[PDB]
Swiss-Prot record, chain B:
Resulting phenotype, residue 86 to L: Impaired complex formation with chlorophyll
Domain notes: The N-terminus of the protein extends into the stroma where it is involved with adhesion of granal membranes and post-translational modifications; both are believed to mediate the distribution of excitation energy between photosystems I and II.
Residues annotated to bind chlorophyll b 3: 59
Inducers of expression: Induced by low light (LL) but repressed by high light (HL). Inhibited by cold.
Residue range from the parent sequence: 95 to 259 of 273
Binding site for chlorophyll a 1: 6, 86
Record's protein name: Photosystem I chlorophyll a/b-binding protein 3-1, chloroplastic
Length: 85, 115
Protein backbone atom coordinates (compact mmCIF):
# COMPACT_ATOMS: atom_id res chain seq x y z
CA UNK A 1 0.00 0.00 0.00
CA UNK A 2 2.66 2.43 1.26
CA UNK A 3 3.82 4.96 -0.23
CA UNK A 4 5.76 4.96 2.95
CA UNK A 5 8.44 2.24 3.32
CA UNK A 6 7.30 -1.35 2.99
CA UNK A 7 7.66 -1.95 6.66
CA UNK A 8 11.29 -1.10 5.82
CA UNK A 9 13.68 -3.23 3.67
CA UNK A 10 16.72 -3.62 6.06
CA UNK A 11 14.16 -4.90 8.60
CA UNK A 12 11.67 -6.69 6.30
CA UNK A 13 14.33 -7.76 3.84
CA UNK A 14 16.21 -8.52 7.11
CA UNK A 15 17.25 -11.77 5.51
CA UNK A 16 20.25 -9.82 4.40
CA UNK A 17 21.38 -12.47 6.87
CA UNK A 18 21.36 -15.15 4.19
CA UNK A 19 24.74 -13.53 3.32
CA UNK A 20 25.63 -11.00 6.09
CA UNK A 21 28.47 -12.08 8.40
CA UNK A 22 26.77 -15.49 8.74
CA UNK A 23 30.14 -17.12 9.29
CA UNK A 24 27.93 -18.02 12.26
CA UNK A 25 27.51 -21.09 10.02
CA UNK A 26 29.93 -21.06 7.08
CA UNK A 27 33.19 -20.37 8.91
CA UNK A 28 32.67 -23.17 11.40
CA UNK A 29 34.13 -25.45 8.78
CA UNK A 30 37.08 -23.24 7.74
CA UNK A 31 38.51 -23.22 11.23
CA UNK A 32 38.22 -27.01 11.32
CA UNK A 33 39.50 -26.58 7.70
CA UNK A 34 43.02 -26.86 9.14
CA UNK A 35 42.02 -29.25 11.94
CA UNK A 36 45.01 -30.88 13.61
CA UNK A 37 46.33 -33.46 14.41
CA UNK A 38 49.25 -33.08 16.83
CA UNK A 39 48.70 -30.54 15.47
CA UNK A 40 48.85 -30.95 12.56
CA UNK A 41 50.12 -33.81 10.25
CA UNK A 42 52.89 -36.17 11.61
CA UNK A 43 53.95 -37.38 14.62
CA UNK A 44 51.41 -38.61 16.22
CA UNK A 45 50.19 -39.44 13.24
CA UNK A 46 47.88 -41.09 10.80
CA UNK A 47 46.59 -44.24 12.48
CA UNK A 48 46.45 -46.43 14.30
CA UNK A 49 47.54 -45.05 16.61
CA UNK A 50 43.87 -44.35 15.77
CA UNK A 51 40.52 -46.06 15.03
CA UNK A 52 39.71 -44.53 17.53
CA UNK A 53 39.92 -40.99 18.31
CA UNK A 54 40.79 -37.36 17.70
CA UNK A 55 38.44 -36.55 16.42
CA UNK A 56 35.59 -38.65 15.36
CA UNK A 57 32.51 -37.32 17.17
CA UNK A 58 30.82 -39.01 19.15
CA UNK A 59 30.08 -40.20 22.14
CA UNK A 60 31.85 -40.47 24.49
CA UNK A 61 34.17 -38.63 26.88
CA UNK A 62 36.88 -39.14 26.61
CA UNK A 63 40.03 -40.33 28.39
CA UNK A 64 41.70 -42.79 28.72
CA UNK A 65 44.56 -44.72 30.27
CA UNK A 66 46.26 -42.39 32.73
CA UNK A 67 48.21 -40.26 30.18
CA UNK A 68 50.75 -42.34 29.97
CA UNK A 69 52.43 -44.16 31.67
CA UNK A 70 51.35 -44.70 35.25
CA UNK A 71 51.98 -47.45 34.57
CA UNK A 72 54.48 -48.11 31.80
CA UNK A 73 57.43 -45.73 32.21
CA UNK A 74 59.09 -49.15 32.72
CA UNK A 75 57.05 -50.20 34.52
CA UNK A 76 55.77 -47.13 36.39
CA UNK A 77 55.66 -45.12 39.60
CA UNK A 78 58.27 -44.18 40.28
CA UNK A 79 62.04 -43.94 40.22
CA UNK A 80 60.93 -46.33 39.17
CA UNK A 81 59.00 -48.80 41.27
CA UNK A 82 60.33 -49.73 43.63
CA UNK A 83 59.11 -52.23 43.59
CA UNK A 84 62.00 -54.12 42.02
CA UNK A 85 63.03 -53.63 38.38
CA UNK B 1 3.83 -65.51 -7.68
CA UNK B 2 5.24 -67.87 -8.36
CA UNK B 3 6.35 -70.00 -6.83
CA UNK B 4 9.93 -71.28 -7.20
CA UNK B 5 10.44 -68.45 -9.69
CA UNK B 6 11.40 -65.90 -7.01
CA UNK B 7 14.73 -67.44 -5.83
CA UNK B 8 17.33 -66.82 -8.61
CA UNK B 9 16.73 -63.06 -8.49
CA UNK B 10 16.67 -63.20 -4.66
CA UNK B 11 19.94 -64.98 -5.24
CA UNK B 12 21.48 -62.10 -7.34
CA UNK B 13 19.61 -59.50 -5.21
CA UNK B 14 20.81 -60.06 -1.62
CA UNK B 15 24.08 -61.12 -3.19
CA UNK B 16 25.07 -57.46 -3.79
CA UNK B 17 23.80 -56.22 -0.40
CA UNK B 18 25.64 -59.21 1.14
CA UNK B 19 28.46 -58.03 -1.08
CA UNK B 20 28.10 -54.60 0.50
CA UNK B 21 28.49 -56.01 4.03
CA UNK B 22 31.71 -57.96 3.18
CA UNK B 23 34.04 -56.08 0.64
CA UNK B 24 33.37 -52.98 2.77
CA UNK B 25 35.61 -51.40 5.39
CA UNK B 26 33.63 -49.65 6.66
CA UNK B 27 32.90 -45.99 7.47
CA UNK B 28 29.56 -44.97 9.02
CA UNK B 29 27.52 -45.85 10.84
CA UNK B 30 28.49 -44.00 13.03
CA UNK B 31 26.49 -44.86 15.09
CA UNK B 32 28.30 -45.17 17.28
CA UNK B 33 30.17 -42.00 16.53
CA UNK B 34 28.56 -39.32 14.97
CA UNK B 35 26.50 -40.95 12.30
CA UNK B 36 26.01 -37.91 10.03
CA UNK B 37 36.11 -36.09 4.55
CA UNK B 38 35.16 -35.55 0.90
CA UNK B 39 33.72 -32.07 0.77
CA UNK B 40 32.35 -32.74 4.24
CA UNK B 41 30.33 -35.11 3.46
CA UNK B 42 29.99 -33.86 -0.03
CA UNK B 43 27.01 -36.21 0.12
CA UNK B 44 24.48 -33.45 -0.73
CA UNK B 45 24.53 -32.25 2.87
CA UNK B 46 21.98 -34.57 4.68
CA UNK B 47 19.02 -36.89 3.75
CA UNK B 48 19.16 -38.27 0.17
CA UNK B 49 18.01 -41.95 0.13
CA UNK B 50 15.03 -41.15 -2.11
CA UNK B 51 17.06 -41.38 -5.30
CA UNK B 52 16.57 -45.02 -4.23
CA UNK B 53 12.84 -44.46 -4.85
CA UNK B 54 13.66 -43.69 -8.49
CA UNK B 55 16.67 -46.07 -8.47
CA UNK B 56 15.29 -49.12 -6.64
CA UNK B 57 12.23 -48.37 -8.79
CA UNK B 58 14.47 -48.12 -11.88
CA UNK B 59 15.97 -51.62 -11.70
CA UNK B 60 13.15 -54.00 -10.55
CA UNK B 61 10.40 -52.69 -12.87
CA UNK B 62 13.20 -52.16 -15.44
CA UNK B 63 14.20 -55.78 -14.87
CA UNK B 64 10.67 -57.15 -15.26
CA UNK B 65 9.66 -54.73 -17.99
CA UNK B 66 11.41 -57.54 -19.44
CA UNK B 67 9.72 -59.91 -19.79
CA UNK B 68 11.36 -60.59 -23.08
CA UNK B 69 8.29 -58.41 -24.17
CA UNK B 70 10.15 -55.66 -22.80
CA UNK B 71 8.86 -52.38 -23.37
CA UNK B 72 11.02 -51.12 -21.61
CA UNK B 73 13.42 -51.34 -24.53
CA UNK B 74 11.19 -50.49 -26.29
CA UNK B 75 10.33 -48.79 -29.41
CA UNK B 76 13.43 -46.54 -29.50
CA UNK B 77 15.19 -44.12 -27.02
CA UNK B 78 17.04 -41.09 -28.45
CA UNK B 79 15.30 -37.97 -27.03
CA UNK B 80 14.57 -81.67 -4.73
CA UNK B 81 14.61 -78.21 -6.38
CA UNK B 82 13.66 -75.99 -3.48
CA UNK B 83 16.07 -78.22 -1.55
CA UNK B 84 19.09 -77.13 -3.59
CA UNK B 85 18.67 -73.41 -4.24
CA UNK B 86 16.83 -73.00 -0.92
CA UNK B 87 19.62 -74.44 1.24
CA UNK B 88 21.70 -72.10 -0.85
CA UNK B 89 19.12 -69.59 0.43
CA UNK B 90 20.37 -70.37 3.98
CA UNK B 91 24.20 -70.40 3.63
CA UNK B 92 23.94 -66.93 2.02
CA UNK B 93 21.61 -65.79 4.85
CA UNK B 94 24.14 -67.01 7.37
CA UNK B 95 27.28 -65.22 6.27
CA UNK B 96 25.62 -61.95 6.54
CA UNK B 97 25.63 -62.88 10.28
CA UNK B 98 29.30 -63.59 11.03
CA UNK B 99 30.43 -60.98 8.47
CA UNK B 100 28.35 -58.60 10.62
CA UNK B 101 28.23 -60.24 14.06
CA UNK B 102 31.59 -59.16 14.70
CA UNK B 103 33.05 -56.21 12.89
CA UNK B 104 35.02 -58.15 10.32
CA UNK B 105 37.66 -55.44 9.41
CA UNK B 106 39.11 -57.07 12.51
CA UNK B 107 41.83 -56.31 11.92
CA UNK B 108 43.22 -58.28 14.78
CA UNK B 109 46.27 -60.44 14.53
CA UNK B 110 48.56 -62.37 14.07
CA UNK B 111 50.69 -59.69 12.46
CA UNK B 112 49.84 -56.79 10.59
CA UNK B 113 48.81 -56.35 7.02
CA UNK B 114 49.48 -52.69 6.16
CA UNK B 115 50.69 -50.84 8.04
Amino acid sequence: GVIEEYLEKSKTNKELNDKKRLATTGANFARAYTVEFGSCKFPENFTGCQDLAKQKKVPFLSDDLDLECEGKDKYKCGSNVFWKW
Amino acid sequence: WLAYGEIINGRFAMLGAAGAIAPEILGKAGLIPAETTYTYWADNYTLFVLEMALMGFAEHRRLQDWYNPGSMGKQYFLGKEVKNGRLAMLAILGYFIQGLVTGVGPYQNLLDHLA
